[PDB]
């Protein structure tokens, strides 16, 4: 399983969880007691946006983020399967706007 560090100083989040390659990051976090934002849970909005600081994901079901947003590291945590150990900033929807 992948090691996923989730951070947000404003929200008081600083936790590293395990996530299998076949579970989405949001779901693994919520299963482990972490309170992350989401609404559609289907990759079609920005509510669950996070930002990769390090690592990689497979978020190929996502349908919202453009190529420049992806290039900067943004991810939709509700449809992102980890493909490496990651460090992710949570609650990053503002950084898109
Ligand atoms: S909650 Fe809408 S894309 Fe993740």
Q: Give the C-alpha separation, 29 to 23, whole Å.
A: 10
Residue 70 DSSP one-character state: H
Residue 67 is inside which H or E element, if any? helix 67-72
Q: How was this structure determined?
A: X-ray
Q: Give the C-alpha separation, 58 to 83, whole Å.
A: 6
For the Cβ of 28 lying below 6 angstroms from any atom of ligand 1, the answer is: no
Of the residues 35, 45, 66, which should be mutated to test ligand 1's pocket, given the most ligand atoms within 8 Å of the CB?
A: 45
For the Cβ of 39 lying below 6 angstroms from any atom of ligand 1, the answer is: yes
Q: Give the C-alpha separation, 74 to 53, whole Å.
A: 9
**Is residue 40 classed as helix, strand or coil in its secondary structure?**
coil
Quote the distance between the C-alpha of residue 8 and its chain's center.
12
Q: How many CA atoms lie within 13 A of 18 on its CB side?
A: 2
Pick the CATH number of 1-97 from 2.60.40.10, 3.40.50.300, 3.40.50.150, 3.10.20.30: 3.10.20.30
Nearest CA to 84 among 53, 62, 63, 48? 53
Resolution (A): 1.2
Q: How far is the CA of 34 from the centre of ligand 1 (A)?
A: 16
Residue 46 near residue 96, CB atoms below 8 Å: yes
For the Cβ of 38 lying below 6 angstroms from any atom of ligand 1, the answer is: yes
């Amino acid at each position: 399983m992948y090691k996923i560090q989730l951070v947000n100083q404003k929200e008081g989040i600083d936790v590293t969880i395990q996530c299998a390659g076949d579970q989405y990051i949001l779901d693994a976090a919520e299963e482990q007691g972490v309170d992350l934002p989401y609404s559609c849970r289907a990759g079609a909005c920005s509510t669950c946006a996070g930002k990769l600081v390090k690592g990689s994901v497979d978020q190929s079901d996502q349908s919202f983020l453009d190529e420049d947003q992806i290039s900067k590291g943004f991810i939709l945590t509700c449809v992102a399967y980890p493909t490496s150990d990651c460090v992710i900033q949570t609650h990053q929807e503002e950084a898109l706007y």
